[PDB]
Amino acid sequence: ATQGVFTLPANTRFGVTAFANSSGTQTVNVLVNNETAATFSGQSTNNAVIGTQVLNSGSSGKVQVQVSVNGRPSDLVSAQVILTNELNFALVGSEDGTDNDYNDAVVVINWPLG
């Protein structure tokens, strides 16, 4: 099944933040309406924030997270969670290798803001 794709409420500000836990340099692309809207990059094995940014979900609301390492797409897992019918998290983990800890890049999307 497709992972890393979320339908946010349209025209909505959301936060996207990425952490790294890998020897490989992580490249996180955030797509809005199928066009790149943000790219984070960095290396860390201690959960360093390699990027954080506020974006607008656009007219479609379609947000896609993609992760690659040295050109090679990472395997993705994802889910969305809603707390008290209001607070939203879109969660992404990725695996660039074989140990399957799926933390090599971790992406957290939250809304609403403000």
Binding site: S23, T25, T45, N70
Partner: peptide
């Protein structure tokens, strides 16, 4: 970070 940590950083 030890032998492995070096290889890691070195190769990637």
């Amino acid at each position: 970070x030890x032998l492995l940590x070096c290889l890691x950083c070195l190769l990637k």
